[PDB]
């Protein structure tokens, strides 16, 4: 309250009034009866335990329902002290339900930022909030995340801090499903950097970036109308001082397959449709195409037009963006010209040579165009394509291909070329985002999709999932490293294996040599291979021999399931071979390499399959991610229906598993989750046995807590002390509190007694001492009362003085 001012207006959405809190934490609670439970319709709802069937449980509900469910269909409920905890990982009850429930509660209260360990959970408001408030920005400036409530700028500032403090590079990993709203965050994070550390004694380029990438890496999905096929990684290169110096974009998966294929309700990248829109007629003649997409098989397999999109407007948007982005006209010409060649390729036709099974060109109409547009020679091109001249042994052996082999190779280049280009564009962007000023560190902001499971998982899914399963391991490790420091700092004795390790199995199966990709990219070299062919190769080699490898359980179709950290994914292998071909005919690449179209020439100097790069790029990335201090952000999507303050359960539950959130909780719950700082330990719990007093009060902030735990009918196991704090397992701290409220009655009542006891014990030592001094006094008086009236004594009295 006092603190909050900076935000003031935002406050209510960040933190709650100091009594709202108080009124919530300090309320009646019955542990032994209050619980969370399974529920057929709603995922997990809360209730009160009624009876106990010896290993069955009957519970009332919150809505009014009675269910008798297993013993482990029942889960404890955190004391009220943990109402809308900033960091769920501080809870003493690391469950599945408690996590769902915490998020949910602080959302119904309009708090979108709640932490879950290292993560920074974020829930889509679906409405407007004063959070991105220009006051907040400052507020979060120079503050550890313990000095302020859960928020993204926390992460974002700390990064910065840390950046200059530790002299290490940083990263922020934003991830969530299609509707979670990451771009929004990403963008918002970015502004943050720009603001808090500006040396413009960009902002558009920065922006303009999107609309280019989007034309090339975005498309109409059956779900979205502008689905990201794209991912991205920006490197904000901070200077030495700490002021801005450079940027660097990189694009991923704008999904190579779209370029060649498309589902029935979908469509390919926008660009194509943009261009054929006709807003810039020169383009059409320049590229040598028509305006009717049905002339380009590659791009009209699905849909061509989308009502919510104005291809004409975008074309310019795109166009203009290129310019702003600083591209050379020529390049801006390559891009276009190159994007049309690809269309043309899909028009390239062939026929069987007579009496031979060879492929022979079915015309030099299209080739001519493709050739010219790329700065190639029609012939040379068609040869290389048809009579691929290979190099088996120590020479170069000319190999002949089949019709089926060509069509597929073509497609492989089409895809290959598009990709590369896309990669290039990104680089070029990054370059502008290129200054001469020195750079000492950078802060990487990664925006990509998270593990999504669909009833239908194709090639694209594998690529993404694979990305995520990697990212995850990346975390699990950082956490293992991190954890282990505490137990080292404190002095606890906990040994444990890297948490990443658990996933290495899956990764090897994909990325290793005889793994999926390889088998995938080899077969792509076989002029007469089939999806079916590929399939078998996949099995013969992995089936029965590999655990993570499995054959689908019929319940569309499926060819193989994998066992990812998030779960089992049923993959359909159909189109892969193609999609993957856009293995690359090196003869052709040769030609590219010596094109008259520099840009094209460039793209292929590092020299091929589609998945071949994806991997290369994904490696270059995960490497950049390593020389980084990882900072994690998990974006969440409340309800498919778009309603603020609401949440479908199982929908959020999902995300949580695939997020890493639930895995971070797991790993937490294996060690010693909750860790109390000593003073923070004294104050709150002294009351439990407060008398463990003369030696517990003349005292130490550490040795005390030690001494304290002396009392209580508590597991002296479950905890562990160390140099700065105690370590505690779950539901313990929960136990403590109870005594405190209930748990302190215990603690106090017992500490009172001894005192009371002891108090009187000193009374006896006094009573006793006194014993005689009284008597002395007693008798002594009596004398006098008797004597004072006696002649002889009065005499002595008057006389007593004359003496000496």
């Amino acid at each position: 309250d006092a603190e909050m001012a900076a935000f003031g207006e935002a406050a209510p959405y960040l933190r709650k009034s100091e009594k709202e809190r108080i009124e919530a934490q300090n309320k009646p609670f019955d542990a032994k009866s209050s619980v969370f439970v399974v529920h057929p319709k709603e995922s997990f709802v809360k209730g009160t335990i009624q009876s106990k069937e010896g290993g069955k449980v009957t519970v009332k509900t919150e809505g009014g329902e009675t269910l008798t469910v297993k013993e482990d269909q029942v889960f404890s409920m955190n004391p009220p002290k943990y109402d809308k905890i900033e960091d769920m990982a501080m809870m003493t009850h690391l469950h599945e339900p408690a996590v769902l429930y915490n998020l949910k509660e602080r959302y119904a209260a309009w708090m979108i930022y709640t932490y879950s360990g290292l993560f920074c959970v974020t829930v889509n408001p679906y409405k407007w909030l004063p959070v991105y408030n220009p006051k907040v920005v400052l507020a979060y400036r120079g503050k550890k995340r313990q000095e302020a409530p859960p928020h993204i700028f926390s992460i974002s500032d700390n990064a910065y801090q840390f950046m200059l403090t530790d002299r290490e590079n940083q990263s922020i990993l934003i991830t969530g499903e299609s509707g979670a709203g990451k771009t929004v965050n990403t963008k918002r994070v970015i502004q943050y950097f720009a603001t808090i550390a500006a040396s413009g004694e960009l902002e558009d380029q920065i922006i303009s970036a999107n609309p280019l990438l989007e034309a090339f890496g975005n498309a109409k999905t059956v779900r979205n109308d502008n689905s990201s096929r794209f991912g991205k990684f920006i490197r904000i290169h901070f200077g030495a001082t700490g002021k801005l110096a450079s940027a660097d974009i990189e694009t991923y998966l704008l999904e190579k397959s779209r370029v060649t294929f498309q589902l029935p309700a979908e469509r390919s990248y926008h660009i194509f449709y943009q261009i054929m829109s006709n807003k810039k007629p020169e383009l059409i003649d320049m590229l040598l195409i028509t305006t009717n997409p049905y002339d380009y098989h590659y791009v009209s397999q699905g849909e061509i037009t989308v009502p919510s999109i104005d291809d004409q407007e975008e074309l310019m948007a795109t166009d203009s963006a290129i310019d702003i982005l600083g591209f050379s006209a020529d390049e801006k010409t390559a891009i276009y010209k190159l994007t049309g060649a690809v269309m043309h390729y899909g028009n390239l036709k062939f026929k069987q040579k007579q009496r031979e099974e060879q492929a022979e060109p079915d015309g030099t109409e299209v080739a001519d165009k493709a050739a010219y547009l790329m700065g190639l020679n029609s012939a040379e091109l068609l040869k290389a394509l048809c009579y691929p001249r290979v190099k088996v042994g120590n020479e170069f052996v000319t190999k002949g291909q089949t019709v089926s082999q060509v069509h597929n190779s073509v497609g492989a280049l089409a895809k290959a070329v598009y990709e590369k280009m896309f990669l290039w564009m990104v680089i070029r962007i990054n370059q502008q985002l290129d200054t001469k000023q020195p750079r000492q560190y950078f802060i990487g902001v990664l925006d990509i999709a998270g593990f999504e499971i669909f009833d239908f998982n194709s090639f694209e899914q594998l690529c993404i999932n694979f990305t995520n399963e990697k990212l995850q391991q990346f975390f699990n490790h950082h956490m293992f490293v991190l954890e282990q420091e505490e137990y080292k700092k404190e002095g606890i004795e906990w040994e444990f294996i890297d948490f990443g390790m658990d996933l290495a199995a899956c990764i090897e199966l994909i990325e290793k040599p005889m793994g999926i990709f390889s088998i995938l990219e080899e077969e792509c070299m076989f002029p007469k291979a089939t999806d079916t062919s590929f399939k078998n190769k996949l099995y013969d080699q992995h089936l029965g021999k590999s655990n993570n490898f499995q054959k689908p359980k019929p319940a569309a179709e499926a060819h193989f399931s994998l066992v990812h950290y998030a779960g089992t994914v049923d993959y359909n292998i159909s189109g892969w071979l193609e999609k993957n071909k856009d293995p690359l005919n090196e003869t052709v690449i040769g030609l590219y390499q010596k094109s008259s179209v520099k840009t094209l020439a460039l793209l292929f100097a590092t020299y091929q399959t589609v998945s071949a790069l994806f991997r290369e790029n994904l490696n270059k990335l995960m490497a950049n991610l390593r020389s980084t201090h990882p900072h994690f952000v998990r974006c969440i999507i409340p309800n498919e229906t778009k309603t603020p303050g609401a949440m479908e359960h199982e929908l959020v539950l999902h995300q949580l598993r695939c997020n890493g959130v639930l895995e971070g909780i797991r790993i937490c719950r294996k060690g010693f989750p909750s860790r109390v700082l000593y003073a923070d330990f004294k104050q709150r719990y002294r009351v439990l046995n407060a008398s463990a007093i003369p030696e517990g009060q003349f005292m130490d902030s550490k040795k005390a807590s030690e001494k304290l735990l002396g009392s209580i009918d508590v597991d002296h196991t479950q905890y562990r002390f160390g140099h700065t704090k105690v370590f505690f397992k779950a539901g313990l701290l929960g136990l403590l509190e109870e005594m405190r409220d209930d748990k302190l009655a215990e603690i106090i009542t017992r500490t009172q007694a001894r005192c009371r006891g002891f108090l009187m014990r000193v009374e006896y030592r006094r009573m006793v001492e006194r014993r005689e001094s009284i008597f002395c006094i007693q008798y002594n008086v009596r004398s006098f009362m008797n004597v004072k009236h006696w002649p002889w004594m009065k005499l002595f009295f008057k006389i007593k003085p004359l003496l000496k």
């Binding site: 009284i774 008086v781 006389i799 004359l802 003496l803």
Partner: protein, 150 residues
């Protein structure tokens, strides 16, 4: 009981007191010795029955020992002043300013059978003012060892 508390100093105070009442120096106090000690102190109105009452308390000639035994016998539960002050200093234990009436009223009546509530009211009247103000234990001790007026 009368030779067991009874220190050399107390006994010398008594010996000097005897030699001041002992007019003749002979070694035995008699009626004559009492008569002029009263006269020397200003008391001329002394009647034989009072002198005789004094002497009648002893079975023989009043000799040093017969005196000391008769005076000890009446003080069978009486200490010298410093010893009495120690008992109060234990009740004081904190020091210097002496105790309150209630605190000792209770402690004389409580542990044991009785310092009776007749005895205690006589105490507040014969020990004072002193017993009201500071329950003046210093004063209490000086009045029991040195007489009532003082």
């Amino acid at each position: 009981n009368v030779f067991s508390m009874f220190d050399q100093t107390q006994i010398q105070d008594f010996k000097e007191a005897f030699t001041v009442i002992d007019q003749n120096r002979d070694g035995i106090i008699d009626k004559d010795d009492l008569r002029e000690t009263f006269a020397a102190m200003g008391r001329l109105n002394v009647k034989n029955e009072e002198l005789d009452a004094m002497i009648k308390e002893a079975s023989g000639p009043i000799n040093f020992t017969v005196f000391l035994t008769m005076f000890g016998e009446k003080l069978k539960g009486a200490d010298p002043e410093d010893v009495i002050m120690g008992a109060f200093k234990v009740l004081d234990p904190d020091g210097k300013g002496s105790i309150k009436k209630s605190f000792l009223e209770e402690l004389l009546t409580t542990q044991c059978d009785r310092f009776t509530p007749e005895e205690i009211k006589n105490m507040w009247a014969a020990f004072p003012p002193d017993v009201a103000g500071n329950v003046d234990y210093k004063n209490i001790c000086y009045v029991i060892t040195h007489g009532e007026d003082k």
